Amino acid sequence: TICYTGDILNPERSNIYTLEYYVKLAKELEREGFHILAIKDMAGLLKPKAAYELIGELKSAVDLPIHLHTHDTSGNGLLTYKQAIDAGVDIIDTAVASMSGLTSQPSANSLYYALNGFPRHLRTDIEGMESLSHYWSTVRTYYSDFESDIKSPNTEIYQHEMPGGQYSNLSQQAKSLGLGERFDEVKDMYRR
Amino acid sequence: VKLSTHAISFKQAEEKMVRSLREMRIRKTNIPFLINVMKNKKFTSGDYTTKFIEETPELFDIQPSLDRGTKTLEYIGNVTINGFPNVEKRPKPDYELASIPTVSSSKIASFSGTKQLLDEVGPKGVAEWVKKQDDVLLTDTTFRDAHQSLLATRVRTKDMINIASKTADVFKDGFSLEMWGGATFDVAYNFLKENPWERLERLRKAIPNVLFQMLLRASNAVGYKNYPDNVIHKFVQESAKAGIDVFRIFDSLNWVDQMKVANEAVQEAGKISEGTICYTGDILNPERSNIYTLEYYVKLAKELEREGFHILAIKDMAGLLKPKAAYELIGELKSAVDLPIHLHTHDTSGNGLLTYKQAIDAGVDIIDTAVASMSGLTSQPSANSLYYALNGFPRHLRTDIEGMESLSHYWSTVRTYYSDFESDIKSPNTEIYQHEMPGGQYSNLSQQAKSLGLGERFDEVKDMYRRVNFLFGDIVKVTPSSKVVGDMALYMVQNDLDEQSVITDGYKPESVVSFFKGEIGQPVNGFNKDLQAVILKGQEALTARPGEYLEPVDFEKVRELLEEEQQGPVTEQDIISYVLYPKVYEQYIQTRNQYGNLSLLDTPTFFFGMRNGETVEIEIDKGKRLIIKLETISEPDENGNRTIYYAMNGQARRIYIKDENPLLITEAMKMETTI
Amino acid sequence: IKDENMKME
Amino acid sequence: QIKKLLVANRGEIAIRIFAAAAELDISTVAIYSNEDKSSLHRYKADESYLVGSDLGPAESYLNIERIIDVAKQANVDAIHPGYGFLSENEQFAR
Ligand SMILES: *C(=O)CCCC[C@@H]1SC[C@@H]2NC(=O)N[C@@H]21
Ligand SMILES: [Mn+2]
Ligand SMILES: [Mn+2]
Known about the structure:
This is part of a larger assembly, with four copies of chain A. The first copy, chain A, is of the alpha/beta class. The first copy, chain A, is built from eight helices and four strands, in the order E-H-E-H-E-H-E-H-H-H-H-H. The interface between B and D is medium-sized, with 13 and 14 residues. Chain B: Keywords: ATP-binding, Biotin, Ligase, Metal-binding, Nucleotide-binding, Pyruvate.
């Protein structure tokens, strides 16, 4: 699994984590004998078009199936998938609808209907996926004591690159250090 | 008491006397009249007679007393003891301080947005411009539609005006701000008891560059029942007078005939007019409906162009226009009609962004987005997320991304003032694609099914909704048309009916019989004669639209009725407001009498009063601010009245507030004693 | 033993 | 001619000038320090402004420019210095 960081669409985001760095990483993994190349986008940083050109690239350069995984922390996780699906993805990581969104994986129940009209087709049972959601939505309410404070998409991850729940758990600790109000400098220091 | 003043000139003795009276605050006396006696030039002249008060008329034309803080004390008093409706009685919670961006009022006066464009070229010039823009123009719904969906439309004016400056600068390159209409007229006057006209006027002043857009229903504008055309014009001109410039016009059954009267008014007033097709069904599923096909939507656009609308707009009020459906619908519309296209969706499936990015590819010109922290689910797609999603693709969304994040952070904290009113919807509901239940209906209808004891029988209520749709032809699910299909689905599950059963036993649901009379419009499938006959059991089924059976309203009598009732000066806004919503306006006025303008209080104090030993500053506006400290409330005295020890503007005050929580035969120790 | 002892409508 | 008047003072004479200013239909701006936030004179005017949170008590009634900002920002025509603070400060009057 290549751990994805930064942005491959901005030529001046990084000089290192560029498109050919991941290609070079993937071939090494093939040369090291892993049966499946999976891209772990642990921060929702792989923008839609970036997903189309990262996946379409490695799809040719490595002869492994491609397993994608992302977090809808930007609100563009489904778009990221639909792009990689149109760029020849093999497996995506999804959660049942009622247990999806935000820092979870993209919504499975939605992506099924998202693909209505486009070439490919999500291999699954919506009728069953709906019932699983109606179940999990309820069971989720026993865990209200543990829900994150994140309630809406946060696009500022594209700057600091905090993963699943680090602009949540940091501000928590940042306040416990006399700097919670001044979290603009943390999101600038953490970026720095 | 008695007041004596003195000076070297009778005028100065009179000037001193005047202010000594206003400075004299006894919080119901002779003061206003006696002040008028002073400013009466006939007095100053020093020559009158015993018939000075009787001779002069407008001595008694006193201006109402600035009760003010004494009323503001009463409100904070009443809520601190007896709470606020629909809010769990809890001590006023500790929210974040949420510092607010500002922008110089001189600089905002330098911007030249899309209202300047309407003030230079007409509406047709604004539309012909939008066409030319390669970039994606955005309309913002944060002030209106986003919080209607997510917060029962409880967002108060104070929270909107307090960022209006930054919003006017952030969306300076935006097409329009959606802020008014929808359900913001009714919820304002009645629930928040705040005047929507001042929300309009105070925002128009603060945001002078961007166009102002509202959601206008063709049948009744912002009303609740049906209205004669005469009132549709009155309301449209007055909103147009007060700053509204983009009127989105829809009808609950996509029936153009009802949209014509609300149309002639927007043309007359000279603003922009959005003719709208409400989207139902599935353009990609041929087996879903044989009525709402791509041909229907292209026809209505041509119909909507012929009827003279300046922009064609598409309203996906239930998130049913899929991403691929968006791609074909708009592109096929874009090449058949020559208007810009204004697309609006609700992100209930979680595909709202996928609808848009597809829609942008087909070339849509304007899209409805809400700021990130107030986006998703039954609201609009996230403007923030969208801006970054087009990274790498050819088209770009014309907006100020860094200004939107600041607008998001502000709204994130503000919304927690409103957590009492959050919808129960935590996740996308992908099965809207079957029952076509509109925004906040598959939850609102679930709470009503629970009332009837159907709470765990919701599969048969969801299915009934979808069956009821087909039963009434294939119709459009939007208020009020969504209410009838709703009420009709419970009924058949209430007493175990089916399709043929409801016709076969029909002669043996107030909204449904109102619907089959045509009191909301004419459906695009008509009615089933056998179905129709049994529901209304024989009365006048409307043979045309509802407006023409209605006598025009005499707005001169209404002005008389209100002036006799109120103080005197009744404005046009007062008039059409009473006409549109009688009881609420009447009630709003009585509340305005008791407590003054509550749209000035901070939203927490509005909802929770204050806690013991806390100080509160109220913007009476522009330099004038009053400071209140609650010291203690007392236990209820002999009656149910408690004494709140206050401190306002340095002067100790007290308010007394009603707390809501033989002869005789008494008992003391299990012993029936009698008086 | 027997013991002898939001705003919206 | 004199729409709105500001008194660069406090207490007894500020309340006094605010009275004569109301008598001639003139809006009155008051100024107050941090240590004077609970003063009588800051509630007798039509508007009120803390001169400077950085400035400390006595400085808040003696900074020529910090006061004049408040006046310009508030659309002031005339300043009455009262007695004793800047009432005799040639450079303030300039
Ligand atoms: C309880 O009824 C007292 C609350 C004080 C009145 C306030 S004003 C805004 C709210 N709307 C309403 O009808 N009562 C509330
Ligand atoms: Mn992970
Ligand atoms: Mn809408």
